Ligand binder design. Structure first.
Ligand SMILES: [Cu+2]
Ligand SMILES: [Cu+2]
Ligand SMILES: [Cu+2]
Ligand SMILES: [Cu+2]
Ligand SMILES: [Cu+2]
Lengths: 124, 334, 334
């Protein structure tokens, strides 16, 4: 399967700079595709907690970009210009093997508030 | 009707300079055209090299002053480059309707809009970005400036008598809320967004890290001091879009001052210190009588000297012993 | 014609910071206005209280980094305060004509002068003071920094592909030639002028007493270590205005490096140690792949550890065993 996350400025319900959806449960071998539904945003790994031995993603700016669900675990992905405004998304590839890293990972402010929300969405 | 009237276009100038313009004018109503471009950028706000993740109209804090006359129409074209990361817009305290323009100027990065409104009321008026949910951030980060709307035949004293300035300097005071690390050093952010969460927290304390004229401690001192000459009359236009201040010219006065900043009302005279309400702009006239360096400041002296809210006016000419003379200079006591 | 073009003032900052600036810009040529203020002073250059009768641009070795873009014009007002004892000027390796500017910028104490040039060429260029017949003295005593003229849309790899830094540090390396008394211990001078002759006597041995980054041994260590984090791409700019150095980053590399310092020329990649010719400035990009304390240094290890040409970079993030791993920690031998 191939899943679509939209890069978007506002959500219908007020608050700004959002990936929609913010969480996505997928399978080994699937591809998530983040998409310039609005210009201004990009998608890219969150290195501080991104897992061992895996193709980092630093997709381009205002540009589409794809993730390859190879190894199975959780995959945090910011939009660099707006990560301080909480524009962030979480991708689950089967087992959440590396949840404990992710929980410890010290996100702050709108990043933390939103990401923790995505964290609860984790299927165990 | 407005579509019918002559469309002039003005070129703006960086503060403190104000663009050139007629005070009194036999000229009739016209639509005046401006353009301003929003620039987000890191700016240096003091001598220690502390930075601010700033946002500005047209490269500067404040944004340039816009000058027109009563009954003109203002036509602002507002551009927000894709080099930017945020939405912006504009609230003209001089407009009527649409949250002062804000609704009809919501531009994303790569967008631009054009908005016309009517200057039915004279005075100095604030303009600032007001994007919804982030009004106080964008404004304290530097997105404010002044719109002067002169009466159609000049500035006027309480006895209806005419009044004239030889130049207008514009000053924007900026209360800043720059965060710190646990080591008491001011923080340095690598992008604008990373500034947000820390900055809002400093905001909520209501205690500025700095308070500055035109962008930096020392913006208007030394070789960037303001200048004038004995006999010359200056208009000092003070704006503060978020917080109160109390200007004062040391060794001087406000010969005539509209501290609420609205020319329709009679000015007060002989002021030592006047008061700009946060979210207002005001103006004051002084005809210089003595040479020397003057200090133009917020007369909270902590805010002035400790936090950065002071500038200088270098003034040339002929000392005058009637007003003031030294009888005996510092000499020892008998 | 340049008199017409827009002008913009830039606030400088102390090494190793580099004032805010765009890399790629969507912006036409302009005239960029800078001020530096020469400061003579006695400076403690090591951890055993040895002093140099120094001469600086803006009170730092090196003087601060000036950044513009190719096609812009540089407008430096250079001020030699009356408190100084010596005349100065400035020679810009980035400039064309009149001995780099020196001939049009001779200022004695109490004087100042303003020089414009077109920055037609891209790269990192040294500027330094060059008063006739006193040239090498002024330069080795601290009178040099870097002009960086970026290409109008950022730096590029050899293939044409754009390259991007998240931050930039500037490092000036100073071969110092500080005299010794007949007792083995270094001299201490009452004035700058008094130090002259003894000093040129040492200069001619071609043997520095010290070689330091940014004005003193350990200048860039402990609390003053540069910082970065795994993932960040930094730009290291290294000037040496009088003598060769060979920079190196322990545990790191130069991912892309312009050792001759000129950006229209393709960078080399994967460098361990690169080479900066006396009277040149170069630039190296590195993206940190690992946390830890790094050292950045002149890889003549004597010049580094005995003499002072070494600094530290402190890097945060998460370790990577793919890149390196301790298979079997130090332990006894079977
Ligand atoms: Cu975004
Ligand atoms: Cu805004
Ligand atoms: Cu308002
Ligand atoms: Cu010199
Ligand atoms: Cu030279």
């Amino acid at each position: 399967a191939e899943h679509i996350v939209e890069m978007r400025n506002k959500d219908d319900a007020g608050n700004t700079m959002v990936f929609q959806p913010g969480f996505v449960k997928v399978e080994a071998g699937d591809t998530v595709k983040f998409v310039p539904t609005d210009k201004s945003h990009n998608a890219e790994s969150v290195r501080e907690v991104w897992p061992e031995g895996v193709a980092p993603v630093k997709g381009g700016f205002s540009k589409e970009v794809v993730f390859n669900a190879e190894k199975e675990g959780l995959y945090v992905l910011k939009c660099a210009p707006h990560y301080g405004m909480g524009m962030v998304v979480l991708v689950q590839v089967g087992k959440p093997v590396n949840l404990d890293q992710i929980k410890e990972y010290k996100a702050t402010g709108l990043a933390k508030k939103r990401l923790d929300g995505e964290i609860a969405k984790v299927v165990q | 009707d407005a579509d019918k009237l002559p469309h002039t276009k003005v070129t703006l100038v960086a503060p403190p300079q104000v663009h050139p313009h007629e005070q009194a004018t036999k000229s009739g109503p016209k639509v005046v055209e401006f353009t301003m471009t929003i620039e987000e950028k890191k700016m240096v706000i003091d001598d220690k090299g502390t930075t601010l993740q700033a946002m500005t109209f047209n490269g500067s804090m404040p944004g340039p002053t816009l000058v027109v006359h009563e009954g003109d129409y203002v036509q602002l074209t507002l551009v927000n480059p894709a080099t930017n990361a945020m939405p912006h817009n504009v609230d003209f305290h001089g407009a009527t309707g649409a949250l002062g323009g804000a609704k009809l100027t919501n531009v994303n990065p790569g967008e631009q809009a054009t908005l016309r409104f009517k200057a039915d009321r004279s005075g100095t008026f604030v303009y600032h970005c007001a994007p919804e949910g982030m009004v106080p951030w964008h404004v304290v980060s530097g997105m404010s400036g002044t719109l002067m709307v002169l009466p159609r035949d000049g500035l006027k004293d309480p006895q209806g008598k005419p009044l004239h300035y030889d130049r207008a300097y514009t000053i924007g005071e900026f209360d800043l809320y720059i965060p710190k690390g646990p080591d008491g050093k001011y923080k340095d952010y690598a992008t604008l967004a990373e500034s947000y969460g820390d900055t809002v927290q400093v905001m909520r304390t209501l205690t500025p890290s700095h308070i500055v004229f035109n962008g930096k401690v020392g913006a208007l001192t030394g070789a960037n001091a303001l200048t004038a000459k004995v006999g010359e009359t200056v208009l000092l236009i003070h704006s503060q879009a978020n917080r109160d201040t109390r200007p004062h010219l040391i060794g001087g006065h406000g010969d005539w001052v509209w501290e609420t900043g609205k020319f329709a009302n009679p000015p007060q005279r002989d002021l030592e210190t006047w008061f700009i309400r946060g979210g207002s702009a005001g103006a004051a006239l002084y005809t210089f009588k003595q040479p020397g360096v003057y200090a133009y400041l917020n007369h909270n002296l902590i805010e002035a000297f400790e936090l950065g809210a002071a500038g200088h006016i270098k003034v040339e000419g002929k000392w005058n012993d009637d007003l003031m003379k030294q009888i005996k200079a510092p000499a020892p006591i008998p």
